[PDB]
Design a protein around this ligand. Sequence first.
Ligand SMILES: *[C@@H]1O[C@H](CO)[C@@H](O[C@@H]2O[C@H](CO)[C@@H](O[C@@H]3O[C@H](CO)[C@@H](O)[C@H](O)[C@H]3NC(C)=O)[C@H](O)[C@H]2NC(C)=O)[C@H](O)[C@H]1NC(C)=O
Ligand SMILES: *[C@@H]1O[C@H](CO)[C@@H](O[C@@H]2O[C@H](CO)[C@@H](O[C@@H]3O[C@H](CO)[C@@H](O)[C@H](O)[C@H]3NC(C)=O)[C@H](O)[C@H]2NC(C)=O)[C@H](O)[C@H]1NC(C)=O
Ligand SMILES: *[C@@H]1O[C@H](CO)[C@@H](O[C@@H]2O[C@H](CO)[C@@H](O[C@@H]3O[C@H](CO)[C@@H](O)[C@H](O)[C@H]3NC(C)=O)[C@H](O)[C@H]2NC(C)=O)[C@H](O)[C@H]1NC(C)=O
Ligand SMILES: *[C@@H]1O[C@H](CO)[C@@H](O[C@@H]2O[C@H](CO)[C@@H](O)[C@H](O)[C@H]2NC(C)=O)[C@H](O)[C@H]1NC(C)=O
Ligand SMILES: *[C@@H]1O[C@H](CO)[C@@H](O[C@@H]2O[C@H](CO)[C@@H](O)[C@H](O)[C@H]2NC(C)=O)[C@H](O)[C@H]1NC(C)=O
Ligand SMILES: *[C@@H]1O[C@H](CO)[C@@H](O[C@@H]2O[C@H](CO)[C@@H](O)[C@H](O)[C@H]2NC(C)=O)[C@H](O)[C@H]1NC(C)=O
Ligand SMILES: *[C@@H]1O[C@H](CO)[C@@H](O)[C@H](O)[C@H]1NC(C)=O
Ligand SMILES: *[C@@H]1O[C@H](CO)[C@@H](O)[C@H](O)[C@H]1NC(C)=O
Ligand SMILES: N[C@@H](CCC(=O)O)C(=O)O
Ligand SMILES: [Zn+2]
Length: 875
Amino acid sequence: DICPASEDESGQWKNFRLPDFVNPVHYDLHVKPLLEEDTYTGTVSISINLSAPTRYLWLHLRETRITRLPELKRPSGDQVQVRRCFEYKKQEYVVVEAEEELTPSSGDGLYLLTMEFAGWLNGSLVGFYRTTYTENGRVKSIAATDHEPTDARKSFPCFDEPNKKATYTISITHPKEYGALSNMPVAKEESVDDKWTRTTFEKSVPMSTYLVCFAVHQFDSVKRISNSGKPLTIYVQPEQKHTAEYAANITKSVFDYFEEYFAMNYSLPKLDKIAIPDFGTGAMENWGLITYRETNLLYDPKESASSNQQRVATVVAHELVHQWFGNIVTMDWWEDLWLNEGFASFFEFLGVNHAETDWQMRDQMLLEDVLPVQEDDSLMSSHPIIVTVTTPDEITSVFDGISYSKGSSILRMLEDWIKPENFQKGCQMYLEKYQFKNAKTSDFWAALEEASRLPVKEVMDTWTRQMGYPVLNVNGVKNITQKRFLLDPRANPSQPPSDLGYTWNIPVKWTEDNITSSVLFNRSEKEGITLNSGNAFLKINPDHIGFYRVNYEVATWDSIATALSLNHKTFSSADRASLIDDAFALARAQLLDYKVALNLTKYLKREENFLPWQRVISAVTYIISMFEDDKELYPMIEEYFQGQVKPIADSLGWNDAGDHVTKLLRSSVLGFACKMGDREALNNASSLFEQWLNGTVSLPVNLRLLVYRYGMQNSGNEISWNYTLEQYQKTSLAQEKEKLLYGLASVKNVTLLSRYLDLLKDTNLIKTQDVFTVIRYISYNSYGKNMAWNWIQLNWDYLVNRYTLNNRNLGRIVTIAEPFNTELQLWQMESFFAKYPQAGAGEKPREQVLETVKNNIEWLKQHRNTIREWFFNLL
Ligand SMILES: *[C@@H]1O[C@H](CO)[C@@H](O[C@@H]2O[C@H](CO)[C@@H](O[C@@H]3O[C@H](CO)[C@@H](O)[C@H](O)[C@H]3NC(C)=O)[C@H](O)[C@H]2NC(C)=O)[C@H](O)[C@H]1NC(C)=O
Ligand SMILES: *[C@@H]1O[C@H](CO)[C@@H](O[C@@H]2O[C@H](CO)[C@@H](O[C@@H]3O[C@H](CO)[C@@H](O)[C@H](O)[C@H]3NC(C)=O)[C@H](O)[C@H]2NC(C)=O)[C@H](O)[C@H]1NC(C)=O
Ligand SMILES: *[C@@H]1O[C@H](CO)[C@@H](O[C@@H]2O[C@H](CO)[C@@H](O[C@@H]3O[C@H](CO)[C@@H](O)[C@H](O)[C@H]3NC(C)=O)[C@H](O)[C@H]2NC(C)=O)[C@H](O)[C@H]1NC(C)=O
Ligand SMILES: *[C@@H]1O[C@H](CO)[C@@H](O[C@@H]2O[C@H](CO)[C@@H](O)[C@H](O)[C@H]2NC(C)=O)[C@H](O)[C@H]1NC(C)=O
Ligand SMILES: *[C@@H]1O[C@H](CO)[C@@H](O[C@@H]2O[C@H](CO)[C@@H](O)[C@H](O)[C@H]2NC(C)=O)[C@H](O)[C@H]1NC(C)=O
Ligand SMILES: *[C@@H]1O[C@H](CO)[C@@H](O[C@@H]2O[C@H](CO)[C@@H](O)[C@H](O)[C@H]2NC(C)=O)[C@H](O)[C@H]1NC(C)=O
Ligand SMILES: *[C@@H]1O[C@H](CO)[C@@H](O)[C@H](O)[C@H]1NC(C)=O
Ligand SMILES: *[C@@H]1O[C@H](CO)[C@@H](O)[C@H](O)[C@H]1NC(C)=O
Ligand SMILES: N[C@@H](CCC(=O)O)C(=O)O
Ligand SMILES: [Zn+2]
């Protein structure tokens, strides 16, 4: 109550954005958690470079309270008279008004502001918090922090903006049974009591608030040493110690690869990794202390899948990229978030490709980022890569497909156009230029433009300052022209307004008879260009390397189908995936007749590669989804696609054999077989499930998920549900737990799914981090599509209270409505949204799922007969 809230607008603290004339240099931060009380206290002393006459000093603070009237120091050292302090809620500030204004730190002397604060460790996964786990029957505690993007201000009062880089010396007073970790190595350990220890860490390099991290733990460790000679260690619960090995391997390999690739030293003396037993995102790149959700870090070769292996490798690689792109060089403002996330999403594939050679990681970029985000970015409710954000809710919202995947995709296009070698050098120069400072997007262009003298800014701005992407329309084999590709044909292609008018500078690549050529397709070529060997067939956009779609003439498309039916290997696996992906997306947008798209699938009985099958399954999943309740169309589509996978499903079999990609292929191919109703695949699932219920037999790691899902679906009951629920509690491996949750969500029983939904309110059973995962799994259930949707509506106030409107996963949960395809269902959504109109971080997802559902309704109206004719005539 000493620093109370007031609604006083008459000041610069009414501004969302922090003032230009106040900068932090150094933070002296001390915190003392009372672990078994779920509280902490702390003091922060901040050195402040003032630049203008101000009677007010303000900075960010949320939920956590100031307990003592703050103390102000002049550059000379004198005590400053402080009249009041107060909180201004609307922009998450605490403001202190001095008696008088005093002016800039002109000569190495700085102001010093000291504040005492108390906060909570409970009810939350952001800021500074405590969670528990069980070790040899005992409940143990671990405390950690999580800040990105606007949560450092919950932990301690600070200038919570990515460009207010300051240096840190952190100390923690904890009980002696615990160790304390932070960004920097331990400097000194001193006894307060015979019970308490004060751990002081050595001074940091300049860094943003969102990167500040500390933890109090009783974890064991697995150790590695870099080529730099620096200790790289993963902290892990003693019972889980053996599952930390693989992450330790990749950390070494990828750390050593990146340091060399970026031509720059890792800035800190050590690097730590730790998985928090309850953790709100996937992982977080805190300078020197990277925090993980266990599924993304901990891997067991004897129980985890190849899928899991790759996920661990990729997230680790991702988190390591950030130590350069994000940490050393940080975006100036969140609008340029892709400078962090896009770069990490691109370089992750390079890291893991170094570590794991036969994973075809470069090709998998198509499956993971490129083709999925081309779906996202064909909606009106997408946004440009450089995004205007004006609230904390808007800031957190842009941690999405666009920042990550399109970021990754347009770098993938850029690298290829500019050539890998020059892209590398260009990244290096940017990295040394803006080291320990902040960069804008223009700065990265200017850096790469110095590596190629190609018109990088001019070309890359078109991809970056407007949403969407083009479809190239082919006239007469050789003439191309560009148009915006939108999934909704009724949508206005000029909206929302763009200076660039939705035309792009398209780096174009094409293959003529195994020889490859390149052109930049200029915006100002309004009537299109012509592509420079007298030719019959011209393969445009090889390996789908550019962020665009190609619509060949119908004749060409027809010839491609026949070419696939005669010898599909004529195309590279990536090229098959891409052609199939484009055709089905073009058909979805009413730019290509569905008969033409479906014809490309006729060859599939002989398809044996991962990439094409993945993009086939993706396209079919949607079509099958739209006809779930059509008793006439569904069996026909099912019957067909069952026959098209049967050969490869049988050939690969129900057993973990072959290399990484083959094993990934088997998972999704057997899964699709099950999905399409194959009696024999379902029986394998039920048979293995029955065996697993017998309590000894350890399932083949790459088949487990399918066995739990389809086994529970086809032969699950209360006895086996209860058992599966027991198993989920008993296993320590998070990757197994998550599979078992999908199993539990698969039962065809309303009563059991109802028990499952009730468990979501029980924190001893379902972790806070997993609630949205479980809701999503249930929504995939034929019964639970409606149950999950109904439950989030009835329990909306409860979820908002538990997570806050600022939590992006809560915001995104409405996307469980994506398969909706009737006017009735759309009315439900709109009714629910009108009832709870304060959407927070859910604002964009709402817009997106509404757009999707409307498209769905239209799609059914446009294509039901055409698709029916195609299947009926064939069968
Ligand atoms: C983390 O990194 C290690 C290397 O940096 C991996 O390598 C393990 O260690 C052994 C030698 O370093 C390897 O040697 C042997 O390989 C041959 C196979 O032809 C066999 O003699 C043995 O299976 C194996 N030696 C053993 C088991 O003592 C192994 O290939 C290898 N594996 C094991 C279990 O030791 C680690 O595998 C790697 N760990 C993880 C989890 O990824
Ligand atoms: C798990 O799935 C396997 C398929 O991937 C099943 O194996 C197949 O079983 C089929 C029937 O038992 C066989 O198909 C045909 O059987 C009839 C019997 O009357 C024969 O005429 C046909 O010649 C034969 N088809 C062919 C193409 O030869 C399969 O041959 C058989 N094997 C394979 C490799 O496909 C498993 O039975 C199933 N397991 C469980 C426990 O359900
Ligand atoms: C691209 O798709 C085209 C449109 O579907 C294909 O052309 C169709 O082939 C069908 C064969 O599956 C034909 O259906 C047969 O003909 C009549 C339809 O009126 C029926 O009586 C027959 O029962 C049926 N055949 C069987 C075995 O049941 C269609 O006539 C035909 N449709 C049109 C509009 O021409 C192309 O073949 C396909 N191109 C490829 C694969 O390259
Ligand atoms: C952590 O727990 C404390 C108390 O255990 C919560 O504070 C209580 O809030 C409820 C209503 O929201 C009141 O009935 C109590 O009087 C409060 N207690 C105290 C001591 O203030 C606190 O809200 C929890 N923190 C979070 C983030 O949920
Ligand atoms: C779904 O599961 C419920 C819960 O187990 C089943 O209800 C049980 O049915 C058995 C046999 O008919 C009874 O002995 C139990 O008393 C019932 N339990 C409860 C809690 O009601 C139900 O039959 C299943 N529904 C299906 C398979 O459609
Ligand atoms: C499966 O698990 C449930 C939960 O433990 C069992 O317990 C019943 O749960 C319902 C609520 O869903 C309670 O109202 C009943 O009183 C519980 N029964 C008790 C305490 O005996 C359920 O019995 C289990 N079923 C099987 C077949 O194991
Ligand atoms: C960069 O790495 C090199 C080689 O390991 C080393 O000699 C140099 O001191 C490093 N630069 C630093 C720590 O600033
Ligand atoms: C393609 O463009 C060229 C050059 O503008 C022109 O000669 C030709 O007629 C165009 N049309 C077709 C179908 O090739
Ligand atoms: N950069 C993190 C997400 C951080 C967050 O959203 O809290 C990741 O994608 O791994
Ligand atoms: Zn990231």
